[PDB]
Design a protein around this nucleic acid. Sequence first.
RNA 1: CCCGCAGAAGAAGCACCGGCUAACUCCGGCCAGCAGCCCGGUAAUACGGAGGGUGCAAGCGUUAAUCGGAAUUACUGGGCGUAAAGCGCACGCAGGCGGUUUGUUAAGUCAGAUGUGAAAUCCCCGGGCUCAACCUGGGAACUGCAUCUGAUACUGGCAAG
RNA 2: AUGUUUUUUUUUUUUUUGGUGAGAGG
Lengths: 105, 205, 156, 208, 121
Amino acid sequence: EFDAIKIALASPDMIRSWSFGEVKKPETINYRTFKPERDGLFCARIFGPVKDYECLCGKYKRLKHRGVICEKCGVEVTQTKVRRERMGHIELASPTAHIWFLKSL
Amino acid sequence: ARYLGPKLKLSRREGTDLFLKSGVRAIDTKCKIEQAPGQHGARKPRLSDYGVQLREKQKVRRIYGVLERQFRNYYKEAARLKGNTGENLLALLEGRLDNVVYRMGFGATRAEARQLVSHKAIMVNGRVVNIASYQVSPNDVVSIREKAKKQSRVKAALELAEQREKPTWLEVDAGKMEGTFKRKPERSDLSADINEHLIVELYSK
Amino acid sequence: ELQEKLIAVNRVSKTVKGGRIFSFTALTVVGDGNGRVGFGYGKAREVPAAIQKAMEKARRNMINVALNNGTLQHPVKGVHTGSRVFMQPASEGTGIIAGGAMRAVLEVAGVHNVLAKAYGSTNPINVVRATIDGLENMNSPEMVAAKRGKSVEEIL
Amino acid sequence: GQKVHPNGIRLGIVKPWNSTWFANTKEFADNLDSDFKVRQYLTKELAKASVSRIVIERPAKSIRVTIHTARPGIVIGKKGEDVEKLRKVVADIAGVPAQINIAEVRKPELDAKLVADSITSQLERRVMFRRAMKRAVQNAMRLGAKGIKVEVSGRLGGAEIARTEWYREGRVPLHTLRADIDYNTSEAHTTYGVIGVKVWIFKGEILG
Amino acid sequence: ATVNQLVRKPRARKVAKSNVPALEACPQKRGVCTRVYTTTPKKPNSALRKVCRVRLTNGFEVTSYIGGEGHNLQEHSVILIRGGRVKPGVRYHTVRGALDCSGVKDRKQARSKYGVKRPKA
RNA sequence: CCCGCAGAAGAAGCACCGGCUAACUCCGGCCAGCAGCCCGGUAAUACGGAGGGUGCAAGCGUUAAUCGGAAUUACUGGGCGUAAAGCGCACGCAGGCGGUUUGUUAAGUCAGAUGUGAAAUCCCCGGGCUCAACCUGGGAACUGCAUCUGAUACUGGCAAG
RNA sequence: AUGUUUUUUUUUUUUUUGGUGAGAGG
Ligand SMILES: [Zn+2]
């Protein structure tokens, strides 16, 4: 299936290629209900729908159009484990050097 | 010439959220969106073949706020035009000035947008257009005029839109309050739940 | 994955010494939204059971239909008993222009675009059968080429 | 009125009696009356508790009741609080020292009377009678009844013309005396009228 | 059927006669009530159906049904008939609320169909 | 046509809700009434009123009238043993159709051109009235008719077999 | 020898497929 594991540095183009959406707002969740934040840390469009094959907000409640993204939801339409593999990226305003390459001794 | 009654009732009847209210407050809180209107709401027997089609037609009409004769005319036009009929119809519907405005985000609802259009707030290529049914063309810039630019409602609408997903077929500026209708939208850009085909069939009786 | 449409349900009687024994016939049709279609005609003392039976029948003895995209490959006539049926391929967008039992069969079959008239009888059971026959007989371009000893470009 | 009562025909063989006492012609009628009273009371009380069979048995100027119920917990309540309460009232009804025993009914889906009661309840709370009947039949079958029949009659779905409908499953031999046929009946006092529910449950044949 | 045959003698169109000939292709006609009366309908129905024999403007003597509950019509009352047959020999209806025929009293639904003005409140 | 003024202000009804047919409940005795075709005799989703709904909307119903559905006069596109429909049977003029080969003709047939087929209307791409209807530029079309020049498989004529 | 000789609506829809810290045993 696969030979050796390769480790290298992460270019900003490589980190934008990993990503699926810029995580802007720090707002985690709503906390008074059950819904998350659009668009905060735990987003919908950047990552995926909490429920499997469902727009979290409201459209597609069967198995026909898996993928459509309406403007009222700003949500993808895939599996419950799809968010576990998808990662976001934070556009750091000011450059910050890595601590692992500045203090490794 | 307009539907002036309860908006959420229509939505309830349809089954779906038609976006007849701004979207500050969720539709489930404002009304029993699952339950149909009237005394006999909880009862829900499977509809007929004709009936489903009719319902579908209503939904679309409701969404845009287009009465029957006009709708029929639009359908006819679509049929006349080359390409897929339902798609064409959809495009035509989109093309309406009020709808475009709504998309841009100068109206909270489509109704609001329509009202704005009526009240000589909107200009298309620097010329005040008052007709909600005005079919906006490709590359036709459409803007709020300087008199109506100070209104608090407009900014609210814009804000609402910003929360809502941005359509690919337009390009809008919040500061300038002018949007360019870049191209007539593809079927993929529009909502998937609308069965245009049913509508087409209904008129092809 | 399979979609199934109960076309009609009809109450049928048998006279006996006491009086009339009633029963119910269910005509259903099932399809995968591609070539495969199958109608089933089930019968029972109660409706739901009958319907179930019909569905079961449908699910076995399916039939394949060559579909050029969303529509048919050429105009095709199909007859069965009273019901004689004409159906004609049509351009994307036009929808299923067809009446009653005939429509249902088409829908499941995964034809999206047809112009179809049912001449003669419109007795659901017969008409669906006719439709099925029409679909079945309808040959594709490739098939025709194979038959004739030619390439597809020779036939166009 | 064609059929013989399935319990009644089998009392000598496979089915036992409910009231189980001896009395001379003098005291017999009175005893019967007492039984009727107590039973009536019990039915009134333990309606919410699923009660199948009250078995009265009076030796030596003292009445022994035995309540067969699906859920003892609701009949007993707190340990010896409700039962005790019941007892004194029973005694009063009789005019003798009372003793209540409570038998726990294993498999209330196979007890016919209970099933009937359930069906009646369902009818009262406006379900589809047919669906209820199906449920009754199915459940019994699942539980291991050799067979079951249920019948419901009159004003079904509030219809003007009354009719009877019935569902059988497995085998329910009524002519066979040695067959353990648990039969019982109930009545749904609906808005349109009464709906009578009969149910036969065939546990199996006894060999002796 | 045979093409030659057809040529010789072409296909005859089925000439359908009008079931309301006293109108003479008019939407309504004015008429005077020659007499007003009740009649019993055929099986399986049972009623006293109110009807008037009307001499029309164009000369025909017809009989016209009178719809709604109650009517003011007498002999020599000028009424408008509209066509429509009650399911023997009545092929026309009096238009309630036209000429001398009054609108139906105390009616609130389908008011148009019985000449009734909109109730004020 | 544009600008200014005031204030939600002056501005919603009609039909329908038994099935066909989108929309259901309660209250009033084969009467009163309904009805396009197929209810009402005391629990009427069918009559009348109400509440609730559905469809249209400055209109909405009804009537009349035409085509449609009606492949129900079937050229496209039906039939006739029993459903309506094979003359009782023949001969036979007119008429319709006509085995096979060659030659010729070129009437039918086909091709191209020319003339015409008024404008408006319809349809296509445009333009102008804020949009639309409406107006409007150019095209296409007007399936035809006539004439000229070809083609000659098929049908016809003529000549020989 | 003989039967169109007491008709009236006593009406058609399913089910559907988690960190932190403390203590004990070995
Ligand atoms: Zn969605």
